[PDB]
Design a protein around this ligand. Structure first.
Ligand SMILES: [Zn+2]
Length: 307
């Protein structure tokens, strides 16, 4: 256990193992990767983002978050694989090299660390944050119903004990506010991808309203192209479309907020599978899932650099 070359990418890891992995990666590739702390979780754990960059200052950027819902383990595992992949392909793959030569990538592998630690020690299916709610015996907020986009509208719950509880007010969760503040302060994000599981869907805005986004034709074509690239490897079938027309109303979601902040290429991926194993996806599917998802993500990044 001395390098990222001996790390086991084909198994699920604990929070500490993932945080340790980030430090190893930074130690091995200091000229390409840096670890930023953008805030703390409710319970006090650091919230880290890896910044991949070849230079410049405030270059156009791509945001990718994983694990905002703690039980979706395939997402944190895919994030760890992505981090290593970026360091292997820069300078080797012509397309990825061109992207990193012009844009920075910010990767948040464990967006909800308190919930992630809770899924390892007490409840494997925990989805929410672990914030304490006064007046309630229930804990946590659905961090993907806490954003300032149609906040509080249908598609979320005002019940603290609900799995889709939206919280007292928009950005009440420090895990969410941390990203909001970082993205707004940076001000030059061009793409915002939030990774979840499961269902095998690639979605664009909106989830809170049936109104079509002005960029619907373009984003729809980008999603169609990304799903085709993804499918080419193992034949995995994904559907794509707007959130509301594909999986129904959902309010306070992250990509609806990012699109409304002017970040055009805002998409959410729902990875494998479609329900056979669900959240308990076998570890043997980690690498194949990461590899095919990479093709879809790269396709989207290629479209942003050229746009
Ligand atoms: Zn999710």
């Amino acid at each position: 256990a001395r390098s990222t070359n001996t790390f086991n990418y084909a198994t699920y890891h604990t929070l500490d193992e993932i945080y340790d992995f980030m430090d190893l990666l930074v130690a091995e590739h200091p000229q390409l990767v840096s670890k930023l702390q953008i805030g703390r979780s409710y319970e006090g754990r650091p919230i880290y983002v890896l910044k991949f960059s070849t230079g410049g200052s405030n270059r156009p950027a791509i945001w990718i978050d994983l694990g905002i819902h703690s039980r979706e383990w395939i997402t944190q595992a895919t994030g760890v694989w992505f981090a290593k992949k970026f360091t292997e392909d820069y300078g080797q793959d012509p397309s990825f090299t061109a992207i990193l030569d012009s844009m920075d990538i910010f990767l948040e592998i464990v967006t909800n660390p308190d919930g992630f630690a809770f899924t390892h020690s007490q409840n494997r299916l925990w989805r929410k944050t672990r914030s304490v709610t006064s007046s309630s015996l229930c804990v946590g907020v659905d961090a993907n119903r806490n954003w300032d986009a149609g906040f509080g509208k249908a598609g979320a719950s005002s019940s603290p004990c609900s799995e889709t509880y939206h919280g007292k007010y928009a950005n009440s969760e420090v895990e969410v506010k941390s990203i909001v503040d970082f993205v707004k302060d940076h001000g030059n994000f061009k793409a915002f991808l939030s990774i979840h599981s499961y269902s095998q869907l690639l979605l664009y805005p909106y989830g809170y309203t049936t109104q079509s986004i002005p960029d619907k034709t373009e984003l729809n074509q980008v999603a169609k192209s990304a799903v085709a690239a993804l499918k080419s490897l193992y034949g995995t079938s994904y559907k794509y479309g707007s959130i509301i027309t594909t999986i129904y109303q959902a309010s306070g979601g992250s990509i609806d907020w990012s699109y409304n902040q002017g970040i055009k290429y805002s998409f959410t991926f729902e990875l494998r599978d479609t329900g056979r194993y669900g959240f308990l996806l076998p570890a043997s599917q980690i690498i194949p899932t990461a590899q095919e998802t990479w093709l879809g993500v790269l396709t989207i990044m290629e479209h942003t650099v050229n746009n």
